[PDB]
Subunit: 227 residues, 2 copies
């Protein structure tokens, strides 16, 4: 039986919501015993990702990621790091600890390739500084980058609303204004906390916005992805 390992806690609110998504998207038919097997390491003590870039302390963060990948390699068959910015550490991690890894950047890339329309990357300044989507996606030409000022506003939404567990729909107007400003109807969840927004839109039946949301995709396609 295949086990998904989740290096989580970045942040904890979205980590818990992702685990919930896994079972919401894979309801069992007859017995509970059919349902996805998942190991979650929800460690919010993980250093601030953008903080680790803005200060000099990338080594500290990379070690955190490496030690926990060592654990999860022994326990799980596939691994996901529940944080986009955190993927910046991967070039420094030995290749053996990334054999089972499913990249959120690549999941986003595959989805955007099918959608094939310009889409607004909603992400932290850290994710933008490290150019994770621009350097990782075959569909980089379809990715619209936020300006520096709008990146800082996304930061506020992430830290003041989403990470603190407040209603994700409270930022919907700010998001719709951004989409209108950048002339698109789609966003990429370039920050995992936008899984929370994506769920809230789906719950309300708001189909006007296309969300390229890697965590929703992983949950939805668990059967096929997790081998």
């Amino acid at each position: 039986l295949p086990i998904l390992g989740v290096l989580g806690g970045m942040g904890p609110v979205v980590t818990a919501e992702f685990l919930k998504s896994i079972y919401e998207y894979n309801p069992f038919i007859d017995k509970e015993q059919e349902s996805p097997n998942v190991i979650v390491f929800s460690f919010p003590s993980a250093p601030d990702r953008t903080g680790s870039i803005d200060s000099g302390k990338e080594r500290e963060f990379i070690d955190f990621i490496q030690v926990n990948l060592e654990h999860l390699n022994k326990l799980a068959d596939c691994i996901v790091i529940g944080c986009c910015t955190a993927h910046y550490a991967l070039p420094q991690i030995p290749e053996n600890l990334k054999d089972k890894l499913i990249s959120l950047i690549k999941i986003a890339d595959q989805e955007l390739q099918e959608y094939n329309e310009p889409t607004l990357l909603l992400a932290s300044t850290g994710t933008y500084q490290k150019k994770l989507f621009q350097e990782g996606c075959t569909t980089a030409d379809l990715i619209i980058s936020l300006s520096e000022s709008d990146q800082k506003l996304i930061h506020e939404m992430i830290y003041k609303v989403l990470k603190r567990g407040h209603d994700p729909l409270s930022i919907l107007r700010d998001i719709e204004a951004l989409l209108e400003k950048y002339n698109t109807r789609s966003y990429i969840s370039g920050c995992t906390e936008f899984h929370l927004l994506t769920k809230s839109l789906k719950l309300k039946g708001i189909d006007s916005i296309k969300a390229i949301d890697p965590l929703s995709t992983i949950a939805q396609n668990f059967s096929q992805l997790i081998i």
Copy 2:
């Protein structure tokens, strides 16, 4: 930093909801880095608990519990098995694998001691057959037992509604009728899926029912319990 280990997946819907409860009850003040560190083994492939009792296959179930306690003993500082019925396996498990264990039966017992009023045990036939609450609680005299017929109705609620992720408030009328039938205003979540009901009551501000709910208690008192 103290880590809670959760042997979960019994069932998965309540396991995910419990992890969510942990962060809902412990909102951070300044930084995310303050928040609870938790390892969840959500393995729904765990054999049916009552099924393992009704068939002859307790050994199979005990081994499942033992192998995963071996893992979590190395990783966590405190351990919780997210299933009341599953506690029946503990007498067969070596004493070294239970040093870090926090019993849901004991958490319920401590709470009932403070409340000090008769309370209806909502639990599976398996939990009743094994007499986990009657044999484990100092406050056993305050525990009202469901009749055999009403135990089977609780079974239906658990399997048809709660485990399948349907709205826990859909069984509220049946629960209120039971409380009235047994002449009390309190229940014990003798089955972990009643954490889902407890959350739903709290969300709606229904204060007329007292829920002795071990998972809510563990989430709420994480700081003090998890050492």
